[PDB]
Structure formats: C-alpha cells, structure tokens
Amino acid sequence: ETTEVIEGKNITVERTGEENRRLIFQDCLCAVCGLCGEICPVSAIEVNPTGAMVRTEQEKSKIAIDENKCVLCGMCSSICPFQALDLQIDGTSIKELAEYPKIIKSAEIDDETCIQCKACETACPQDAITITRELPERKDLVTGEIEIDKDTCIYCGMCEEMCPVDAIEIDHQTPSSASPVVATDIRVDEDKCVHCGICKRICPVDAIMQVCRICPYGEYEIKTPEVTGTSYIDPELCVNCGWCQEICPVDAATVTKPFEGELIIDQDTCQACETCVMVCPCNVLSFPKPEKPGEKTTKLHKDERFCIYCGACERSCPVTAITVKRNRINTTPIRSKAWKNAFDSLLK
C-alpha cells in the first residue's frame, strides 16, 4: 500500500503500517550528481542528465523514483551529500536514528574567534551562512559642536549644498505677502554631522559656529568601536566544500568532508563548454582569465580543497574530459552487510 505524491517538482513516497515510512525528495536542493541512483539496491531511481537539468529549463524533476520497486531502505537518503533526500520513520528523520548509518561531515564557526568580516557569507557557494554585525552609530565615532544663528542666516543655501553628508536642512518656501521670506528655518542633524568644517568656511555671513573635538578629546568622548554579531550555518543548504574555512582571515571556520578522492582533468579533451563549471555545487572549477595580453592560462582550473567528490562534473561532461575517483566514504558504524556493500560499490 505504498503511495507517491508529486507536489510541484518534489516527490514524496510513503508507505503506511505499524511503521510509517516516507521518502521526501526536494528538487530545489538536488545537484543532480547521480549518487542516489547508483547506490539504490533495487534500481528504483532514475537521474536525468546533469547538464540539461542545470543549464536548461525543464518541467521534469531531476530524479524519478519508482513506487513499485522502492523498498524504502534509505540508502539514497544516507548517501545524498546535498540533503535533497530524507527518509522519515514514524516520522523521525533517519539522520537522528542511530540504527541508520550516517555520512560524517561538519561545518562550524567559532563565534568567539569570528570578527564578523562576512567573507564566508560571500564565499559560500550555497548561501548557507548568515553573518550579522551591528556597527556603531556614526554620531558615536565623531565629536564636535555646531550651531547656526538663524537671525544672521540669509538662507543662501550654500552650506546645504556643500554639506557632504546632507546634515543641514533648510525649510525652503515660495514667498507670499503674508510670509515674505525664502525659508522659515534651518537645522543641523547632528546624527549625521561629522564636523568636517565645510559649512562654516563657505558661510557668507559667518552664521555657523562649528568646533571639531576629535583630535584633542577623541580619547575620552569617542568610545573604541566594539563590533558584535553572530553566525549561522544552515545544515541542509550546507555541503561541506570548505570555502568558509579557507577564506576566513582568522581561521574561525572548520569543515570536515564525507568523501576522500581525486579530480582528474584532461585539458586537451576538454573543449571548455563550461558545463561542469556551472554544474559544480562547490565552485571547484573555473576559467582563469589571463592577466596580461598574450598570456595563456590552463583551460580548466580546479582546486580540490573545495571538492567533495560528488561526481556531478564527470556526470555532466559530454566528452568525459573530467573523471572522479573516490577512495574513502566516512560513515558512522555500519552493521548491515547490505549497507556495507552499497557504500563500497561507490568507491573507485
């Protein structure tokens, strides 16, 4: 009495009974690497072409799961490096059940070491990181006095124009016989004023008194900036490429990966169609631009530091100019021998 519900591009396969099982596929998280289809013991999964699903518009889901063949064992869910497949039992996801082998990976930020520079937020190929920071207010990094004598003021507008932070505001108006003036008020917004002195120097009637205190009194009136914030790594968007670890200027980020392997590229077979570059979910692959004219660059550049060996590049390449080997798949202890054969069959 199994079921398959298709909602948009997502797929839910469910079986009811004393033990309720449900396999949920989230199309938006799928990188089309193919690993689920390979590990499936009953060949219940069909994975569409990697390049086509990434580079072109398609109404089909990235994978298809056959209700009638699926035995809901959850190996595809276990292996999936992109968290796009989740098997749930009596609805608890197998990643919390110790009975089910789990791939070992992690991504962490030491928030005490972190200085909120936000490079990792920018670098993250999956937008998995949120970094917040609260900067001081401008008024608190600056010191001075400023006041405008409105009776001396003739409302020529020169200070309002010259003020580089638009701190001065003039209440302009069209004159009337009842109110024969071109402005009714003038104000300085000291939340914006940085005490540069321009207004007072340009004032044609010396109506502005302005004193900057930064250098003599800055030690006492300006508090040392102390910038706070925090970090968050989304565990389902996160894929453990390690970009944050490598980009971090204070080594506050640490990443461990599930697979060990190598990347092998044949530069002459490669014709630079850019498919694998666009396919790579970890931004491992790039086309270096030559720095000076006449210079040549390697056709397809890799940096395996960011590589997770999911195999999507190899799968997408129509000339197999790029191949992936996989020596080690780190998992929690496996007791079933069926599970140990499936995990070892993905090694090469």
Partner: peptide
C-alpha cells in the same frame, strides 16, 4: 547517440 545532453547548444 553521442549527445551527452549538457545544454551548451541550447544556451
């Protein structure tokens, strides 16, 4: 048969 459906032609 030699088409790998990468999508470059389409783009």
């Amino acid at each position: 048969d030699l088409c790998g459906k990468c999508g470059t032609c389409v783009e």
